[PDB]
């Protein structure tokens, strides 16, 4: 019984299943054929890592005002594809009034205008630190994180999406890598925590809001080891993420993040570019959208070919991964990180907790940024 991965904090039964998988499908097996190479597929956020690359990047870009837009442009961007209906009651302002994108976008614009007027990086002469004590800075940060937590995409929009990657408008890909290189080095240093942000006592359209936001991102020793071990045994290890491809590639291929994956093995959401290669807040319809059933389309069209088979193992953590976790008969092992989330994914967790030989739950301790050797997670979880 040869072992191919380090034990670390894997749940025992998964640990055994992974070794059986690599012995069966890996280069050590007499049936191995390099002309019919096996592959596996994993989600990135909260699966391969603790945290979420877009969640972490949003926090960074907001705090550092890392945007390549003028105020009017910025106002139009943050409203793009957002449903105009009032936000759910749990997001009411401190005065118990309803809030919506019209009100919050005006407030953010007024704040951004002051940032644009004062910051060295824009039209002013002040450093970031020199504005961080200001009401407008406090307002921009709190209301931005609020708007990205509270908003829902308009079901009639061409792209069903109003999330953070649009904030990269006007960036070229190389500028995204540059941004991320610095963003992730800093975010990996952040104490893992849920932080609360409250907007200042000033006059505004939306009034005062407060928002809680998860701050933290960390690599996982078990996933670094697993991905490395798969490749070393002749099993390709692909990432299929709903995050913007430039962002996830920047993180996964970064030399400081341990995984050191090759960009061709990392797939995500595709945004269109103009002729100069500047990013546009618009999906590139030439590719499948890599979420839910779209992850299966991505595997079927962009990964599978005549020289491979799989996925022999799939890893995921949320409803977005449900389709790919159950789709393929070739999948021997469907690994589900045990988050405090529910819905479609609970169907597969039920199979796992009822003794499935395919679906397995792996526990984590979120605030400790670690796996735990159990199928159940421990401590605060999201």
């Amino acid at each position: 019984m040869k072992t191919y991965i380090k034990r670390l904090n894997w749940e025992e039964s998964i640990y055994l299943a992974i070794n059986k998988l690599i012995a069966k499908h890996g280069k050590d097996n007499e049936a191995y054929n390099p002309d019919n190479k096996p592959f596996a597929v994993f989600d990135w956020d909260n699966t391969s890592i603790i945290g979420d690359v877009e969640e972490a990047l949003l926090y960074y870009m907001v705090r550092n005002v890392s945007f390549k837009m003028d105020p009017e442009e910025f106002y139009e961007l943050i409203r793009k594809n957002v449903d105009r209906k009032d936000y759910p009651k749990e997001f009411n302002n401190l005065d118990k009034q309803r809030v919506n994108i019209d009100l919050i976008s005006q407030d953010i614009k007024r704040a951004y205008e002051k940032l644009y007027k004062n910051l060295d990086r824009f039209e002013g002469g002040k450093t970031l630190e020199e504005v961080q004590d200001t009401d407008y800075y406090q307002e921009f940060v709190s209301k931005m994180l609020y708007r990205y937590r509270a908003s829902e995409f308009d079901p009639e929009a061409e792209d069903p999406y109003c999330w953070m990657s649009f904030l990269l408008k006007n960036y070229k890909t190389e500028e995204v890598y540059d941004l991320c290189k610095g963003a992730y080095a800093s975010m990996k240093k952040e104490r893992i925590r849920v932080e609360e942000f409250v907007s200042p006592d000033i006059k505004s359209e939306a009034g005062r809001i407060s928002i809680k936001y998860f701050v933290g991102i960390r690599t996982l020793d078990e996933m670094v080891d697993l991905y490395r071990s798969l490749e070393e045994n002749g099993i390709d290890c692909y990432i299929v993420s709903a995050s913007f491809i430039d962002i996830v590639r920047a993180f996964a291929t970064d030399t400081n993040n341990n995984y050191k994956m090759k960009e061709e093995k990392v797939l995500g959401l595709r945004l269109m570019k103009d002729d100069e290669g500047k990013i546009l807040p618009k999906f590139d319809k030439d590719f499948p959208i890599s979420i839910r059933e779209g992850k299966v389309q991505t595997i079927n069209k962009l990964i599978k070919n005549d020289r491979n088979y799989g996925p022999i193992m799939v890893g995921g953590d949320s409803d977005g991964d449900f389709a790919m976790l159950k789709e393929f008969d070739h999948t021997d092992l469907s690994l589900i990180i045990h988050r405090a989330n529910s819905g479609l994914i609970d169907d597969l967790r039920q199979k796992a907790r009822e003794g499935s030989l395919r679906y397995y739950s792996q526990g984590r301790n979120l605030l400790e940024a670690s796996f735990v050797p159990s199928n159940k997670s421990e401590g605060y979880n999201e």
Side-chain angles (χ1 to χ4, degrees):
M1 277 305 201
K2 178 180 187 177
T3 76
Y4 292 98
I5 52 161
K6 302 177 183 172
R7 177 55 203 283
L8 299 173
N9 278 313
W10 286 107
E11 187 273 322
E12 170 71 9
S13 79
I14 299 179
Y15 174 80
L16 288 182
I18 293 174
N19 288 316
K20 295 175 190 171
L21 183 96
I22 299 175
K24 175 184 171 184
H25 293 280
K27 67 172 206 257
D28 287 345
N29 196 278
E30 51 193 5
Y32 187 92
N33 172 20
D35 296 329
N36 187 31
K37 186 167 182 181
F39 69 87
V41 173
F42 297 86
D43 198 358
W44 192 256
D45 298 313
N46 285 303
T47 297
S48 298
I49 57 167
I50 290 279
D52 178 296
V53 297
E54 288 183 331
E55 184 175 50
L57 183 57
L58 171 62
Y59 176 86
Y60 186 89
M61 299 185 67
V62 166
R63 296 274 305 172
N64 293 269
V65 202
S66 310
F67 308 104
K68 291 177 176 301
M69 288 177 277
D70 62 74
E72 180 46 46
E73 181 174 23
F74 188 87
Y75 169 78
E76 295 188 18
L77 189 285
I78 64 178
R79 295 159 58 79
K80 199 178 186 178
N81 303 332
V82 180
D83 198 313
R84 305 300 199 250
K85 63 176 290 186
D86 286 352
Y87 295 152
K89 295 174 185 293
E90 48 268 39
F91 300 105
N92 282 352
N93 71 8
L94 307 193
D95 279 347
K96 307 316 178 177
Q97 295 171 304
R98 306 300 295 272
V99 178
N100 57 42
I101 188 61
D102 285 334
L103 304 177
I104 201 75
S105 64
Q106 201 66 257
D107 298 345
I108 287 164
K109 179 181 178 184
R110 304 293 172 208
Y112 190 73
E113 287 169 349
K114 283 186 158 190
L115 286 167
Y116 198 84
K117 175 185 184 177
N118 284 286
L119 282 180
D120 192 40
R121 78 181 285 133
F122 298 116
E123 295 188 329
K126 300 191 175 188
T127 74
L128 180 57
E129 192 207 325
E130 292 178 340
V131 310
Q132 278 176 348
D133 286 10
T134 68
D135 278 11
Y136 61 88
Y137 177 78
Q138 178 181 344
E139 173 90 335
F140 178 80
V141 172
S142 56
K143 293 198 159 157
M144 276 288 289
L145 301 177
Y146 173 90
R147 175 261 173 258
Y148 279 93
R149 288 253 290 112
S151 299
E152 48 190 314
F153 69 80
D154 177 326
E156 274 52 76
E158 191 183 65
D159 303 324
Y161 181 100
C162 59
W163 175 237
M164 69 84 50
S165 68
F166 282 179
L167 290 172
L168 292 170
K169 184 193 174 173
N170 294 338
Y171 272 76
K172 303 183 179 190
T173 293
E174 108 255 3
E175 293 170 336
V176 174
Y177 279 69
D178 287 338
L179 166 68
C180 288
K181 184 67 171 176
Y184 294 136
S186 179
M187 291 303 290
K188 275 162 72 191
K189 294 161 50 187
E190 296 280 358
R191 172 177 48 96
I192 305 285
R193 68 197 189 268
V194 170
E195 195 166 0
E196 185 183 13
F197 302 80
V198 181
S199 69
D201 187 20
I202 62 170
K203 180 175 188 184
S204 71
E205 307 280 17
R208 302 186 75 187
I209 57 76
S210 69
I211 187 71
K212 278 194 276 255
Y213 196 92
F214 183 90
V215 180
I217 185 168
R218 300 289 176 92
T219 65
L220 283 163
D221 296 345
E222 285 89 349
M223 302 310 260
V224 173
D225 176 58
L226 172 62
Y227 296 170
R228 194 198 312 273
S229 297
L230 289 173
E231 291 280 352
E232 292 180 346
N233 282 271
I235 303 155
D236 284 330
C237 188
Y238 288 90
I239 302 301
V240 172
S241 174
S243 298
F244 177 30
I245 189 172
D246 286 7
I247 294 177
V248 57
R249 281 178 169 189
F251 190 99
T253 67
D254 189 337
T255 58
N256 303 135
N257 293 334
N258 310 294
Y259 300 91
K260 294 175 171 171
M261 307 191 82
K262 305 306 178 178
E263 68 179 357
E264 56 262 36
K265 297 284 174 67
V266 184
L267 296 76
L269 180 63
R270 309 298 183 106
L271 292 180
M272 239 189 312
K273 300 178 178 182
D274 72 12
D275 316 283
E276 296 178 8
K278 295 189 166 188
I279 286 160
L280 298 166
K282 183 161 172 43
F283 286 3
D284 183 341
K285 286 187 169 62
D286 288 344
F287 301 85
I289 294 166
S290 46
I291 194 157
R292 294 175 288 274
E293 296 96 334
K295 293 202 180 191
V296 173
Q297 185 69 0
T298 297
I299 293 159
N300 281 342
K301 297 292 195 178
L302 304 182
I303 295 176
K304 287 178 154 191
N305 56 54
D306 298 325
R307 305 282 119 124
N308 65 21
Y309 76 98
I312 66 168
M313 179 178 181
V314 180
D317 68 295
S318 71
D319 281 9
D321 295 316
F322 174 78
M324 74 163 175
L325 280 160
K326 63 166 292 181
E327 170 76 15
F328 301 101
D329 294 3
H330 271 166
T331 300
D332 281 357
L333 169 38
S334 292
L335 165 67
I336 310 153
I337 305 311
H338 197 165
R339 290 186 53 190
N341 58 12
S342 52
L344 267 169
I345 192 67
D346 278 340
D347 175 48
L348 305 187
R349 298 201 174 112
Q350 171 167 317
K351 291 177 185 309
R353 66 167 171 264
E354 283 198 283
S356 176
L357 293 172
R358 168 167 170 172
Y359 302 97
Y360 290 84
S361 278
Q362 170 64 54
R364 66 176 187 173
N365 184 323
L366 177 58
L367 295 186
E368 302 292 346
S370 179
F371 275 8
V372 288
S374 170
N375 54 30
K376 51 200 192 299
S377 287
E378 128 197 326
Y380 176 79
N381 203 10
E382 297 192 8

